[PDB]
C-alpha cells in the first residue's frame, strides 16, 4: 500500500459509516426555523426582552481563558442579597439565578452587584393591574416609552483599559525577572523537603 514518502494515514472508515451520515442540507432551514421561534417567542413576551433574563459576568476557569469574562449562568444568592433583591422575586423581574455558583472574591461580587443595580434602574415594571399602580411598579409615564429589548440584555463590556506610560524606577530596573521565576520554581519544589526540618 505505501508507495513513497508520505504520511501514515488512519482513515476511521472501518465501521458501517454509511448508515450514520448526517448531511447539513437543512442547515439554512433550521436558521429560518430558529429565527421564526425567536420572533414567535418575542411576540409571546412582547414587553420582555427576547434574549431572556439578565445574565451575570463570570470569569472563565482555566489559565487559557484567564483574562476573559463571560456571560454566566445566574446571579449568586450573595449578589442578590447585596443588591436588595429577593431570591424568588428575581425570576419574576427577569434576573437569572443559580444557587450552585459561589463568590470566591469580592471582585466578582462587586462586579455583578453593580450590574444588578444598573439593571434595576433600566427596568420598567408594569403594574399587575393598570387601575392599581403599586409601590414597586413604575410610573405611568415610563410605561409608554417601554419597548422590547433586542439583543443580549446588557451585553458585557470588555474595557480595554491601558496602563499609562510611567517613568521606570531604578528599583524597578533592578528586578531580576528570570531569577524571580527561577527561584519561585525551585522553592516550590523544595518546599516539602524543607518543612521536614
Amino acid at each position: 500500500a505505501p508507495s513513497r514518502n508520505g504520511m501514515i494515514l488512519n482513515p476511521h472508515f472501518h465501521k458501517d459509516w454509511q448508515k450514520r451520515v448526517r448531511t447539513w442540507f437543512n442547515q439554512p432551514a433550521r436558521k429560518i426555523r430558529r429565527r421564526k421561534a425567536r420572533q414567535a417567542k418575542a411576540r409571546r413576551i412582547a414587553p420582555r426582552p427576547v434574549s431572556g433574563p439578565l445574565r451575570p459576568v463570570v470569569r472563565c476557569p482555566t489559565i487559557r481563558y484567564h483574562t476573559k469574562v463571560r456571560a454566566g449562568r445566574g446571579f449568586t444568592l450573595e449578589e442578590l442579597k447585596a443588591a436588595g433583591i429577593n431570591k424568588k422575586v428575581a425570576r419574576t423581574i427577569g434576573i437569572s439565578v443559580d444557587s450552585r455558583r459561589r463568590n470566591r472574591s469580592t471582585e466578582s461580587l462587586q462586579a455583578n452587584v453593580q450590574r444588578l443595580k444598573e439593571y434595576r434602574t433600566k427596568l420598567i415594571i408594569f403594574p399587575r393591574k393598570a387601575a392599581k399602580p403599586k409601590k414597586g411598579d413604575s410610573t405611568e409615564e415610563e410605561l409608554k416609552m417601554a419597548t422590547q429589548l433586542t439583543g443580549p440584555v446588557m451585553p458585557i463590556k470588555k474595557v480595554h483599559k491601558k496602563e499609562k506610560a510611567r517613568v521606570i524606577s531604578e528599583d524597578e530596573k533592578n528586578f531580576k525577572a528570570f531569577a524571580s521565576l527561577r527561584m519561585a520554581r525551585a522553592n516550590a519544589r523544595l518546599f516539602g523537603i524543607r518543612a521536614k526540618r
Binding site: 501514515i8 482555566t62 484567564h66 496602563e163 521606570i168 521565576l181
Partner: protein
C-alpha cells in the same frame, strides 16, 4: 469535475493505465498499514523512523489548558502596540516609557530572539527567558511579572 479527468483519455485502452502483466486487483499488498514490520518494513524504516515502539511517560488526563503557554519573541514585541506609540516615545527617551502588557495580548512567555529598538519599555508577562530580560534590561526598561 470529470471533464479534465484522466479516465476520459483512457477510453479504448484495455488495462486502463494499470498494466497487462500486473493487473489492478483488490489490495495486492494488504489493507492500510498492513505488513509495516514484515513486507512494508523498508518503506516504514526509510520514511517513518520511530514508528514502532514506546517512548516516554504517559499522561492519562492531559488537559491542554494546563500547559497553555503561548510565547512571543522580542522582534514582534512592539507589534502589540501601535506604530505611532513606539515613535512618540522615541523622541522622549528620558523616562516616559510605554508599557507592553503581553498577557492582555494573548501571550504568556517572552523569548529574546530578535533585536529590540533602542527605547526604554516596560514589559509585563507571566514568564521571561534569561536572554529576553537582559535584552530588555540592556536596551533600558524593566520586566514586570504578572499572574
Amino acid at each position: 469535475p470529470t471533464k479534465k479527468s484522466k479516465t476520459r483519455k483512457l477510453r479504448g485502452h484495455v488495462s486502463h493505465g494499470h498494466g497487462r502483466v500486473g493487473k489492478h486487483r483488490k489490495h495486492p499488498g494488504g489493507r492500510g498499514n498492513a505488513g509495516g514490520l514484515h513486507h512494508h518494513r523498508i518503506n516504514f524504516d526509510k520514511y517513518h523512523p520511530g514508528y514502532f515502539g514506546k517512548v516516554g511517560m504517559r499522561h492519562y488526563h492531559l488537559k491542554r489548558n494546563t500547559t497553555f503557554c503561548p510565547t512571543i519573541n522580542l522582534d514582534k514585541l512592539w507589534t502589540l502596540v501601535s506604530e505611532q506609540t513606539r515613535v512618540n516615545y522615541s523622541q522622549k527617551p528620558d523616562g516616559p516609557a510605554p508599557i507592553i502588557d503581553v498577557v492582555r495580548a494573548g501571550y504568556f512567555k517572552v523569548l529574546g530572539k530578535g533585536k529590540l529598538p533602542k527605547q526604554p519599555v516596560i514589559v509585563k508577562a507571566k514568564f521571561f527567558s534569561r536572554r529576553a530580560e537582559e535584552k530588555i534590561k540592556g536596551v533600558g526598561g524593566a520586566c514586570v511579572l504578572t499572574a
